[PDB]
Amino acid sequence: KLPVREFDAVVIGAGGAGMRAALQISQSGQTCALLSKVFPTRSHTVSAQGGITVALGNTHEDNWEWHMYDTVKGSDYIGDQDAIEYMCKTGPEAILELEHMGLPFSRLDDGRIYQRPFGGQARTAAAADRTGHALLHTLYQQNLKNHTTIFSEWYALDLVKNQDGAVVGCTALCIETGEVVYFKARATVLATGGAGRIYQSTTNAHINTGDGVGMAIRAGVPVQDMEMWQFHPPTCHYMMGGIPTKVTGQALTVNEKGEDVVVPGLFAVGEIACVSVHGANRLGGNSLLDLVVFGRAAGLHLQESIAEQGALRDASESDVEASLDRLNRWNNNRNGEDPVAIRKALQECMQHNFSVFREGDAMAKGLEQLKVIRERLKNARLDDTSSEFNTQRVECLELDNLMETAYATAVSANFRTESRGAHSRFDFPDRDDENWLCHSLYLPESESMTRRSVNMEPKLRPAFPPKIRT
Amino acid sequence: QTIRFPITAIASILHRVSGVITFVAVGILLWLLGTSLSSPEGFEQASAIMGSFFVKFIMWGILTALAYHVVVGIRHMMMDFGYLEETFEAGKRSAKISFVITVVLSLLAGVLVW
Amino acid sequence: QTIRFPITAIASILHRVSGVITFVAVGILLWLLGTSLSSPEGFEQASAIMGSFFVKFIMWGILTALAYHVVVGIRHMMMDFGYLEETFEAGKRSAKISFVITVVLSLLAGVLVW
Amino acid sequence: NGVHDFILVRATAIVLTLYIIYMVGFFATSGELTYEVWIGFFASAFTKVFTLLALFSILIHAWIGMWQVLTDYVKPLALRLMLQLVIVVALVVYVIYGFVVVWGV
Amino acid sequence: NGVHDFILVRATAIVLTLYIIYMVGFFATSGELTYEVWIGFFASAFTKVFTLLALFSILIHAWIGMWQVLTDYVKPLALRLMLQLVIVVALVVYVIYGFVVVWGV
Amino acid sequence: NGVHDFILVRATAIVLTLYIIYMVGFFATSGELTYEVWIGFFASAFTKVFTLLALFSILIHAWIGMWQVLTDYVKPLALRLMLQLVIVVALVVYVIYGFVVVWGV
Amino acid sequence: MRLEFSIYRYNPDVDDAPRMQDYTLEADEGRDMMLLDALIQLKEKDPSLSFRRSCREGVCGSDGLNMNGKNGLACITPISALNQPGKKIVIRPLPGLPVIRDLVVDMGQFYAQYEKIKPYLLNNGQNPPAREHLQMPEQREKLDGLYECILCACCSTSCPSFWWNPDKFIGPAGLLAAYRFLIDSRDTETDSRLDGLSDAFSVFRCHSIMNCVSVCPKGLNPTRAIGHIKSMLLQRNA
Amino acid sequence: YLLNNGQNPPAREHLQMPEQREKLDGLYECILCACCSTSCPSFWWNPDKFIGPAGLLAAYRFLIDSRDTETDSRLDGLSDAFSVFRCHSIMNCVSVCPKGLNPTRAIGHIKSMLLQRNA
Ligand SMILES: Cc1cc2nc3c(=O)[nH]c(=O)nc-3n(C[C@H](O)[C@H](O)[C@H](O)COP(=O)(O)OP(=O)(O)OC[C@H]3O[C@@H](n4cnc5c(N)ncnc54)[C@H](O)[C@@H]3O)c2cc1C
Ligand code: HEM
Ligand code: HEM
Ligand code: HEM
């Protein structure tokens, strides 16, 4: 019964990393959908009091080799540099390609890009207080330029997963129409990001209902180190981890052994998509640099991905029954417990026992706390009976999303017997570099944890070992 | 619906209202000039009609509204010539002084009446 | 800067200069007609003002410049009607004949003066 | 267009300013007006020409003025059209009456 | 536009040519002009109507003429605008004075 | 343009209708017209202003009328142009003669 | 503070147009809060409310609420400025907008009006520079008041001239965009935009109301745009 | 021919109330037999400047077919040329029409709308 429309590219999120993706799919030409939750400019990216960072050449010399040196000494030598390779080699190109869009970046008296200093040793630029504001506004103005058809004020509740294990589209539930639709498309780029809503005091905004991990994990898509979580100095600010992917775009899964395999029909960029180029302390604006240049790569790497996987099928139109039965279960609850109290207790437990300090005894204590709360969560009452429109409805769904992210971080506190990078422990303050030189991995259906090895940056430069932090 | 602070609206409306009434003024004054100049037989007649206190009230109103219109018109003129600078304080001081000189020119009409 | 051979420039400028002076001529002649016709008391007065040799110089100049303007105007008219053919010899012969008839019409003004 | 209107309004307001200055200045320096002096100050050239110029400029100005009013406020189209007709005939009647009353003296 | 101007200039120059021909032809055939004959040759219909037509055509012609001059030479814009205002009031004053001086006879 | 012409024609036809009604109504209620009564009914304001308004409106109307005729029928361009010149001078001469014959009474 | 709240209408789809139901809650005095916190606290008792909130820092024009008759940023405007001596704080939705939801009303007319100004650069293709654009910061120091219009629709709904003719006008910010893409020296397509704006009586429909500047949430100058663009336009078509 | 700037208010099929179709039943069957066109007195003298009756039936069809939103550009493009008004309301063509179509109706509503715009 549900009306469906055939597409070649859909995007989960509108601005930040998403604007880039939809713009590159527009200049591709076939078709470029644009779904979101809020009107583009209202995206969290608009809070932008920190400038884009890319070396274009000051009065002095600045090479991409120094770029790699500083961006790796910052990351505390934990992740692979293939993505750092691509970043430090393609950044300037993309930033100047954006500067040709008339993007109002502040210049120097000669007429050249302005540059300022930050932590570590010579390029942390800035336009004004509103740098990313101008970034988003210019990407939106180019969206107008190429007439990309935005579908704003909607939601994505879950993705599609067939028998052979592919993704061929996404469902949607709106606020202007409020009726679920299905956009079927081989390319579904989860580029939304953010979860901090599950905590009390943080920098993030309330539109971040924590979905980029919600649909992923619920659909059964794995994740990499959902506990790499930076707390801006002492308020939480960033989710280093997120869905896995590569520099070219496609997400990754694992078999019963643990070998990384390309997932059919999924993509990811933006602060959600993690390649750990931010690590312990993100470089100033390397999530910004992520959403710009990694997204430019996600655009330039479209034909290479669609050619190997294409002309697939739907799960006999029987997988939309998954989210359909989720919404039916929504059509189940009449009374019970208010979801507000559930979220309250969860938030409390997590900010209590999974911030900078995670103490083993209290770690298992909060584990069983959040676990019993998860068990009892099923029967939740519903404050609004409205037929046409409300807010509460989406609020309801966001619970079944928010909590899930926290889960992963909690579990990972049982998988790291040291204080590695931002991750810190009272019972383990040091940083061992012999066992967990590799990423973590949360397997959804088994809810378990495993490891995933990392390369020692061989692309074009003789590698260097992890130095001592002194 | 209600905003309670239309400081500019009152200043502005007073322009089109005065224009709309002066547009019929000019016709009343064309009539008065016509009926007056025709001969002596009318002149005193005309002054006779310049006499009644209803008519005196009107004519003073005609000329007061005219003065308001002229002054606000000059403000629109000079302010758009670029000869006047833009800010809040300039706007409120222009309102003040224009209103004062409007009442001043009004008093001139009163002097004519008396 | 200097070109030393603006044959057309002199012919052309003489058009806008004469226009600019005739534009004030027409006002001088409206004044003269006004002050003349008002009554007999002015007519001789007007002729009195038609008298001075400065004034006679002016009025003859008014009418000479007028004649130049009229003639060049006709050339612009006929030449653009397509009734006149284009070439160098046509241009120089038109210059010659127009200038001759301009001086001829000038002489008419002199005859009026005398 | 629109800048056409703008410029005509500003310029004709300039002429109108000069007028009202001169005319109500004469009212000022009246000093016991009389029929004799009244017809005196009117029968001139200067007064005659300046008053006809004033009425003509009021035409060319108030036309655009009421056009702006009746394109901003009175919404129905047939109404606004007939209303502008009434007002334009009002102005042209103003100027012609002006004629018959100044070139009769 | 521009062809509008072109055609108005050519046509009104046609009427002006006919005028100057007729008027200075009367000057030619004057033969000892007198006040009597002067007011005679003016009080006619023909002369009255043709002179008013002449002044009107001079308006409609010299307007565009000085527009061309002051759009080619006087470069600053505020200047040229006020200059055109002075010149246009000059022409309309010309025609109205013409009125007061021909329909008084 | 074209709707400009349309509206001017309709409106000036409205004024003309009102005129002919009033004027030939006076012819109706004549009741043994005399020179005395003839000059009587003309020397008024109302008649004077309404007749000048009528001739002016006939100008502004018949201009566009003959423009339409001579853009539909007379094909050669030089011809049609000079023909419109003759007709427009005819109308302006109509209105000026009207002047000299109504503001003389 | 223990407070009653009185709003326009908390459910539009109900048959009746007006609905002034009594909001009630008991709030504390020993801790300040902002209007959005009032919303957060209420939303669990009177369930049928709705609102469009984004950022809790007021940077993306989410909630430009016009309460009690005065507009402001809901994430800049606390409650004390509403609980003045007297009663009946008024936080009704915004003006002149379609009643499609309680407080997240439509802006299609507004955003479309912004759209009709072509708010984007355009280069015919000349490449005077090679690697990077060439612009003297003398521009940027006078461009710092155009590229932060957060589209909160405070000024647009607050223009007396714009009201009567909603479609024929262009609004203040719709002109801030034009001016931005005008005096940004990195373009050369001034004339076409100018004489496209010249045609419509939209530029001049302004009566220099100037109220919007005070009412602006960012403290932006639309009057300045209305000044220079009028100057330039006049200069062209004179 | 239709033209959609690109907005997709619907998803699968267009949205139109048959109240249009019951008043659209007299435009989309012009069989181009050139009876009315050669039978218009107004059109004769100026063959190129006019637009003909059926040339206006097409305009009206693509006008009051609610499935478009590009009325103004077509209207003020037609407004420029004196083609719409070159009509003297001859009305003979209706009798002469082979299909029994109403061009006069098109000449009526399009004049009304055009007048409404450019007044
Ligand atoms: C003061 C300050 C300092 C900063 N410092 C740094 C720094 O040091 N380093 C750094 O890297 N960055 C920094 N940033 C940038 C910022 O913190 C983020 O890193 C960055 O904005 C991430 O943007 P994004 O494109 O990845 O996400 P976004 O573009 O915000 O992704 C969200 C998108 O998805 C949409 N969306 C929202 N909810 C949903 C949903 N439920 N379903 C689907 N779509 C949805 C949104 O509308 C939006 O389009 C700073 C920012 C500020 C304000
Ligand atoms: C004396 C008779 C006058 C008449 C009949 C007249 C006519 C009008 C009318 C009716 C209006 C309002 C309609 C409109 O234009 O929006 C108007 C506006 C205006 N008037 Fe006059 N006016 C007169 C005097 C003046 C004078 C002396 C000035 C001096 C500068 C002036 C300046 C203006 C200006 C600038 C406007 C446009 C401002 C606006 O939009 O309100 N007016 N005119
Ligand atoms: C008698 C009073 C006249 C006045 C006040 C007058 C006005 C003017 C003026 C001032 C100019 C120069 C400005 C310009 O147009 O570029 C001009 C140009 C012109 N005049 Fe006249 N003119 C008069 C007589 C005539 C006559 C009798 C003719 C006969 C054909 C004529 C033909 C022209 C032409 C063709 C031009 C345009 C050529 C050019 O650009 O120089 N003028 N007119
Ligand atoms: C009394 C002197 C009148 C004159 C000099 C005059 C002038 C003209 C002329 C010459 C035409 C034919 C040229 C054309 O427009 O196509 C015309 C058409 C027209 N006349 Fe008059 N007319 C007069 C009276 C009237 C009156 C009283 C009406 C009353 C409504 C009227 C209504 C029309 C209309 C509607 C047209 C256009 C219809 C068409 O194209 O044939 N006319 N006018």
Ligand code: SF4
């Ligand atoms: S008032 Fe200022 S901040 Fe608000 S929408 Fe308008 S331009 Fe933007």
Ligand code: SF4
């Ligand atoms: S007369 Fe009717 S059927 Fe014949 S061509 Fe014209 S529109 Fe078609």
Ligand code: F3S
């Ligand atoms: S339209 Fe009016 S409200 Fe201000 S910005 Fe312009 S004067």
Ligand code: F3S
């Ligand atoms: S052009 Fe004439 S023939 Fe009929 S369709 Fe129109 S009235």
Ligand code: FES
């Ligand atoms: S909440 Fe986003 S702007 Fe105030």
Ligand code: NA
């Ligand atoms: Na993440």
